[PDB]
């Protein structure tokens, strides 16, 4: 097993969707947790996009980076945007990327759909490395 992490500027959107895909795609061979540089409520329209794929996020909650430790996570996927990054040990795990993505907080359904697709594809790519 490999442990994946998703970390956003707010957790609520980019990471939350990535967690929903990652557990559906790989729950049983990877363990996922999303966080954020700072927390915010899991965003409601996110639910709808995951419902398009046939998944949900209503049933889970948001969480700050501060509540965990990088040492437990094999792979860390920041999704802060504009190449913003994490000073702590989260950047020094076995795999690191920053998924530049159009943070769906308060956006149009087209932005949501674009990011939801991009995220899902990138979770599948990340799993393919570790599988």
Curated annotation (Swiss-Prot):
Changing residue 8 to S: Abolishes arsenate reductase activity. The active site is at 8 (nucleophile), 80 (nucleophile). GO terms for molecular function: arsenate reductase (glutaredoxin) activity; protein tyrosine phosphatase activity. Transmembrane segments: none annotated. Its EC number is 1.20.4.1, 3.1.3.48. GO terms for biological process: response to arsenic-containing substance. Keywords: Arsenical resistance, Disulfide bond, Hydrolase, Oxidoreductase, Redox-active center. InterPro entries: Arsenate_reductase_gluta (IPR014062), Ptyr_pPase (IPR023485), Ptyr_pPase_sf (IPR036196). Cys-8 probably provides the initial functional group for covalent attachment of the electron-accepting substrate, arsenate, to ArsC. This is Glutaredoxin arsenate reductase. It comes from Synechocystis sp. (strain ATCC 27184 / PCC 6803 / Kazusa). The gene is arsC.
């Amino acid at each position: 097993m490999k442990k994946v992490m998703f970390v956003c500027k707010r957790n609520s959107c980019r990471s939350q969707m990535a967690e929903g895909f990652a557990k559906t795609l790989g729950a049983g061979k990877i363990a996922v947790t999303s966080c954020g540089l700072e927390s915010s409520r899991v965003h409601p329209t996110a639910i709808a996009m995951m419902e398009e794929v046939g998944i949900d996020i209503s049933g889970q909650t948001s969480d700050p980076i501060e509540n965990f430790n990088a040492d437990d996570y094999d792979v860390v996927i920041s999704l802060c945007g504009c190449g913003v990054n994490l000073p702590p040990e989260w950047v020094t795990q076995e795999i690191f990327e920053d998924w530049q993505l159009e943070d769906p907080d308060g956006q149009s359904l087209e932005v949501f759909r674009t990011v939801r697709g991009q995220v899902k594809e990138r979770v599948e790519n990340l799993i393919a490395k570790i599988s």
